[PDB]
Structures are given as structure tokens and as C-alpha cells.
Amino acid sequence: FVNQHLCGSHLVEALELVCGERGGFYTPK
């Protein structure tokens, strides 16, 4: 991404930083 890693809930939070819309990226829930 840019500095944080992408494992655990860090990857999901990174998807929101990319687009930001719900049901737009991988949303495990």
C-alpha cells in the first residue's frame, strides 16, 4: 500500500482507502 502491511484487518482498511464505497472491494462481512 504505502507504509502499513496488508495482513489481518490492515488489508480491508486499505481497500477503503483505495475506493471508499461499500460492496465495492473485498469486504469480509
Partner 1 sequence: GIVEQCCTSICSLYQLENYCN
Q: Is 9 in the site for partner 1 (CB under 8 A)?
A: no
d(CA 17, CA 29): 17
Q: Is 7 in the site for partner 1 (CB under 8 A)?
A: yes
Q: Within a 10 A sphere around the Cβ of 12, how many other Cβ atoms? A: 14
Q: Is 13 in the site for partner 1 (CB under 8 A)?
A: no
Joined together, the cell numbers standing for residue 9 give 484487518
Joined together, the cell numbers standing for residue 5 give 502491511
Taking CB under 8 A as the criterion, the residue among 2, 9, 22, 28 binding partner 1 is 2
Interface with partner 1 (CB under 8 A): 1-7, 11, 14-15, 18-19, 24-26
